[PDB]
Amino acid sequence: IESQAPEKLVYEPGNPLADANGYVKMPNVDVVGEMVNTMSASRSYQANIEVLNTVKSMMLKTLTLGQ
Amino acid sequence: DHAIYTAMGAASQTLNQQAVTASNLANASTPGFRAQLNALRAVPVDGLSLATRTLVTASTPGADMTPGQLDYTSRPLDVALQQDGWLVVQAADGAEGYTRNGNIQVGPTGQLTIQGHPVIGEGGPITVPEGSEITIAADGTISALNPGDPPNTVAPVGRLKLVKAEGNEVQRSDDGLFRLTAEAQAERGAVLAADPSIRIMSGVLEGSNVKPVEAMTDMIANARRFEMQMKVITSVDENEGRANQLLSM
Amino acid sequence: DHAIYTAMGAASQTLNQQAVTASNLANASTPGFRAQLNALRAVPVDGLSLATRTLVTASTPGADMTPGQLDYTSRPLDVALQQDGWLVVQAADGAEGYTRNGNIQVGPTGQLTIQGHPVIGEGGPITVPEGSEITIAADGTISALNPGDPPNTVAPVGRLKLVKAEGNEVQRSDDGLFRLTAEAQAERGAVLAADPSIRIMSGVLEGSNVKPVEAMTDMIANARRFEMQMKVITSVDENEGRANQLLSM
Amino acid sequence: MISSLWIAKTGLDAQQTNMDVIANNLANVSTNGFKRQRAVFEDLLYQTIRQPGAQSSEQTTLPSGLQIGTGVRPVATERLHSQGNLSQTNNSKDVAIKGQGFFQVMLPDGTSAYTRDGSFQVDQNGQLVTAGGFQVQPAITIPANALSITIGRDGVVSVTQQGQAAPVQVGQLNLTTFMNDTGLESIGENLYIETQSSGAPNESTPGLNGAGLLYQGYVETSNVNVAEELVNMIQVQRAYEINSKAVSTTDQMLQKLTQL
Amino acid sequence: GAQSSEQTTLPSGLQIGTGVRPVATERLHSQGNLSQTNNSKDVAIKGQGFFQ
Numbered sequence: 030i031e032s033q034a035p036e037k038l039v040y041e042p043g044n045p046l047a048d049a050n051g052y053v054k055m056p057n058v059d060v061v062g063e064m065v066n067t068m069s070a071s072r073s074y075q076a077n078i079e080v081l082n083t084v085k086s087m088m089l090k091t092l093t094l095g096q
Numbered sequence: 097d098h099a100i101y102t103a104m105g106a107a108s109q110t111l112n113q114q115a116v117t118a119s120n121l122a123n124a125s126t127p128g129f130r131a132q133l134n135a136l137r138a139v140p141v142d143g144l145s146l147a148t149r150t151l152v153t154a155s156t157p158g159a160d161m162t163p164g165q166l167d168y169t170s171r172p173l174d175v176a177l178q179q180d181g182w183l184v185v186q187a188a189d190g191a192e193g194y195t196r197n198g199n200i201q202v203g204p205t206g207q208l209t210i211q212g213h214p215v216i217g218e219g220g221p222i223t224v225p226e227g228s229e230i231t232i233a234a235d236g237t238i239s240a241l242n243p244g245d246p247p248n249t250v251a252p253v254g255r256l257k258l259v260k261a262e263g264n265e266v267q268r269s270d271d272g273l274f275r276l277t278a279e280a281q282a283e284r285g286a287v288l289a290a291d292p293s294i295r296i297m298s299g300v301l302e303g304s305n306v307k308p309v310e311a312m313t314d315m316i317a318n319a320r321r322f323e324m325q326m327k328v329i330t331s332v333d334e335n336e337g338r339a340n341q342l343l344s345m
Numbered sequence: 346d347h348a349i350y351t352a353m354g355a356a357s358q359t360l361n362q363q364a365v366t367a368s369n370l371a372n373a374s375t376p377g378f379r380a381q382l383n384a385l386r387a388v389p390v391d392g393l394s395l396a397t398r399t400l401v402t403a404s405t406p407g408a409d410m411t412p413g414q415l416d417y418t419s420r421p422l423d424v425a426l427q428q429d430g431w432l433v434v435q436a437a438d439g440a441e442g443y444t445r446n447g448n449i450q451v452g453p454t455g456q457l458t459i460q461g462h463p464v465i466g467e468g469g470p471i472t473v474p475e476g477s478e479i480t481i482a483a484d485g486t487i488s489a490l491n492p493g494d495p496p497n498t499v500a501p502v503g504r505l506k507l508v509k510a511e512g513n514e515v516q517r518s519d520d521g522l523f524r525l526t527a528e529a530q531a532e533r534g535a536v537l538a539a540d541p542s543i544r545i546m547s548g549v550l551e552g553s554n555v556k557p558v559e560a561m562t563d564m565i566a567n568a569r570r571f572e573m574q575m576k577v578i579t580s581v582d583e584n585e586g587r588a589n590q591l592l593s594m
Numbered sequence: 595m596i597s598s599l600w601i602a603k604t605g606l607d608a609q610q611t612n613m614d615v616i617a618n619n620l621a622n623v624s625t626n627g628f629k630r631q632r633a634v635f636e637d638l639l640y641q642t643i644r645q646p647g648a649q650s651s652e653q654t655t656l657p658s659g660l661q662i663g664t665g666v667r668p669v670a671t672e673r674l675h676s677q678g679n680l681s682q683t684n685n686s687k688d689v690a691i692k693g694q695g696f697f698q699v700m701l702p703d704g705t706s707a708y709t710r711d712g713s714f715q716v717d718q719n720g721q722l723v724t725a726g727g728f729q730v731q732p733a734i735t736i737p738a739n740a741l742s743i744t745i746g747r748d749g750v751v752s753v754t755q756q757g758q759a760a761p762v763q764v765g766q767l768n769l770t771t772f773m774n775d776t777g778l779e780s781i782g783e784n785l786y787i788e789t790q791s792s793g794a795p796n797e798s799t800p801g802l803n804g805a806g807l808l809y810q811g812y813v814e815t816s817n818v819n820v821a822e823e824l825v826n827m828i829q830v831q832r833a834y835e836i837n838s839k840a841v842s843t844t845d846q847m848l849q850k851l852t853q854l
Numbered sequence: 855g856a857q858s859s860e861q862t863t864l865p866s867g868l869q870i871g872t873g874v875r876p877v878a879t880e881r882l883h884s885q886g887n888l889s890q891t892n893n894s895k896d897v898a899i900k901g902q903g904f905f906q
Binding site: 044045046 | 862863864865
């Protein structure tokens, strides 16, 4: 989906893409939030990777049940 | 792991505060600008057990109703309001907004317009004769003179309505125009009275009330707080990377 | 894993922005120079599911047609155009380029040559008698007085053609000379008219409109964006490397 | 780039524009008829982010919502049209204005400009010009061998000839007034052109219908108050430094953010 | 690309450019002021010209 925050504006009334009341639209990305998202996503990715490794060892050990 | 988000909030909110002061601090030398004082609000996150997290949202509790100080321009119809006094202006949509900018102007057709979206006084828009030579009296009465007539023909042509409303009962409204807070409307009505005690000075403008000392200390505090939260974020992330190793073997 | 590419794109393209600013910024004190403003374009990657990636391609939408500020040199044939005006000049390949450099020069044989590849006005290249003593008028007429003749012999020897065109309807052409955009060619034609309303300021040159303020924050934001991209790249590769242990064993 | 950077750069742009206004307004002392310019700024729209809630009035509650707003775009450059002082130039063909009014001048391209400047001359054909040869409409053609030129307080210009005991009235020099003097679009060369914000020009003889009288032998000086410009310069420099501090603080915030 | 003009679009292409090479050092030949040396063998010039 899209984050529907009101899309912070700037003023450059010679630039095309500026309406009446020349106001360019200037994406509303909060860099701190996105950096924290990247950090947390990498950590969760690592946790799931390493769950997968644990489980794979668990099952390959199950195959040696008895013999 | 969720601690990082609390810290994240602070950092982002700190940036928001910076933005405020920036638009607060760039607007020096803006006539009649009212500063936008800012604050941080604690938001407890009451839940199911051991409420330790609280978030750090930012806020603007309003505008600073401290009168900035005066520039003597000697212009006949530069108007300065006394304290807690407002000029009324017909806003863009058509509504009574309130301003402190007294840099009045007269159009070629005789229309008295603090910057377009013109002024309101004793009736609809104030209109004056084209050959202006306008003067604004001490209590607002607007007197006029055709430039080529004897000086004893200066009978008043209008009145400049002024309004007393301050602080907790005034709210900025996405323009340079203030309005009533929707709480001071189950009160003094939607269209306010003229308050026959608000005086005017002609030939004087009022400038922005942006105190630069509190702005500078605000920016210093903001930088320090931001980088403290940065350390917290680093420590939490390094903890998470350290601890995802419980699951191996 | 392909995220790194997007991040790479940004980093690479940010360097391009830097490059532009640098060329935009070294060219201060270059006569009549037009700053090449720059922008970044989001480029979605429309695909078969989950449109999540966008690239950061760099671009130069055009030049800044904001008149640079004038230097008074009192030299008789240094020309400053009014706003949105251009001197027409016979380009190297041969075509009417447009410049704001009014630093006109005369050769020994009387060729008016804004830095060579000469100037075009009311006919071919403008030629004057060798003992020129050129004077340039307000509307573009060029008069010449041989040094050893009575001063009431300043009969006009030519006219300097000037053209009105700005911004959207003008683009740089890999030299310092501008041309029409080929979108303004099924319009005011291949060769424009003289527009006898563009005025000349004689004895005054125009400098570059290289705004140091917006360039300095261009560079600050560029550096910050670059090292944010580097952080994303670092996290992505560390993810992939620590991931690679899945397939073994 | 985050919003703080761009807002502070709008502030720096505004201070730079204000300094350009001050420098132009300053350099044009000893320019006849020049009218001082004042830079008027205006804030840009405020983006409400979180509307204020309900002020329950059960306790004193801070009315906190959140609107940030941006920018300081320059909204006007008002021309302060006032009667400047007079200085004697002792030149017969020179004249200043007592009160409002503008001499009409025929531009080279055909339209009409208007000047508050009396540095007049005569070209080779007797026509009045304005320091650059622009003809003063309506044309006033001084005879060839006049003993003296007189321009009266209502513009009635006459010449004294060898022998006749009468100042033959050779022309009329009438003024032009606008209903909004401030709206004139300055073009350089001490010339203003009428625009939609000034209305049509109203022509009249001096001293009638609000036009100001004429004072021969005097030039109107620039109404520039240099003390005001110096104080404004100090203010502009300090505000510029404060905004630069805003940019620098945001930049070091960003440095720390991108460290990790 | 082409300005399709259906919507207001930025005319984005890309050219980077480089350099500020010095192209000339002009010599401004305007008449300078004169100084009296009282020296008989000295001489100054009124207008264009040079001594060979």
